[PDB]
Structure 1
Amino acid sequence: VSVNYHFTRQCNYKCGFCFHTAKTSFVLPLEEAKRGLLLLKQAGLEKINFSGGEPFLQDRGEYLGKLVRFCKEELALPSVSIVSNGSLIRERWFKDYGEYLDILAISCDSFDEQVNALIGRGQGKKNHVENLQKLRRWCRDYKVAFKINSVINRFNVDEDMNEHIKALSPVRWKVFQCLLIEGENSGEDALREAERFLISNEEFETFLERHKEVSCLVPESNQKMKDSYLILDEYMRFLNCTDPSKSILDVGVEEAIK
Structure 2
Amino acid sequence: GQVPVSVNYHFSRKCNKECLFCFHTATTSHVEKPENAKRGLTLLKQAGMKKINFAGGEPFLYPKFLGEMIDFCKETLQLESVSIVTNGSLVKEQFLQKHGRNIDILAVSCDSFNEATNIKIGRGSGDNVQKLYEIGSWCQKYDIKFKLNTVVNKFNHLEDMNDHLNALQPFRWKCFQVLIVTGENDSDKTLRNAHSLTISDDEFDRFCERHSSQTCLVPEPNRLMAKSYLILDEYMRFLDRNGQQPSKSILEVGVQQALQAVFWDEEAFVERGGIYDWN
Q: Same fold judged by TM-score > 0.5?
A: yes
User: For 1:8 and 1:167, how far apart are their aligned partners in 2?
Assistant: 33
Q: Contact conserved, 2:182 with 2:241, CA < 8 A, in 1?
A: no
User: For 1:62 and 1:222, how far apart are their aligned partners in 2?
Assistant: 34
Q: Which residue in the other structure is 2:198 paired with?
A: 198
Shift of 1:227: 3.2
Q: Gaps spanning 5+ residues in structure 1: where?
A: none
Decide which of 87, 97, 101 is 1:95's aligned counterpart. Answer: 97
* Equivalence map 1:38-187=2 (5 Å): 38-58=42-62, 61-122=63-124, 124=125, 126-187=126-187
Q: Letter of the 1:200 partner, please give it.
A: S
Q: Gaps spanning 5+ residues in structure 2: where?
A: 261-279
Q: How many residue pairs get matched?
A: 254
Q: Letter of the 2:131 partner, please give it.
A: N
User: For 1:87 and 1:214, how far apart are their aligned partners in 2?
Assistant: 26
Q: Contact conserved, 1:177 with 1:199, CA < 8 A, in 2?
A: yes
* Equivalence map 1:216-231=2 (5 Å): 216-231=216-231
Corresponding residue SS for 1:106: strand
User: For 1:132 and 1:153, how far apart are their aligned partners in 2?
Assistant: 20
How high is the sequence identity, in percent, across the aligned residues?
Answer: 57
User: For 1:148 and 1:222, how far apart are their aligned partners in 2?
Assistant: 19
Q: Letter of the 1:55 partner, please give it.
A: P
Shift of 1:237: 0.2
Q: Contact conserved, 1:229 with 1:240, CA < 8 A, in 2?
A: no
Q: 1:253 to 1:194 in 2, by over 3 A?
A: same
Corresponding residue SS for 1:238: coil
In angstroms, what is the RMSD of aligned CA positions?
A: 0.8
1:32 aligns with 2:58: no
User: For 1:11 and 1:189, how far apart are their aligned partners in 2?
Assistant: 19
Per-residue Cα deviation, 1:6-54 (whole angstroms, up to 9, x for no partner): 0010011110000000010000000000000000001011011000000
1:232 aligns with 2:207: no
Shift of 1:138: 0.6
Q: Contact conserved, 1:226 with 1:240, CA < 8 A, in 2?
A: no
Q: Letter of the 2:8 partner, please give it.
A: N
Shift of 1:155: 0.2
User: For 1:151 and 1:241, how far apart are their aligned partners in 2?
Assistant: 18
Q: Contact conserved, 1:15 with 1:119, CA < 8 A, in 2?
A: yes
Q: Contact conserved, 2:50 with 2:80, CA < 8 A, in 1?
A: yes
Q: Letter of the 2:218 partner, please give it.
A: V
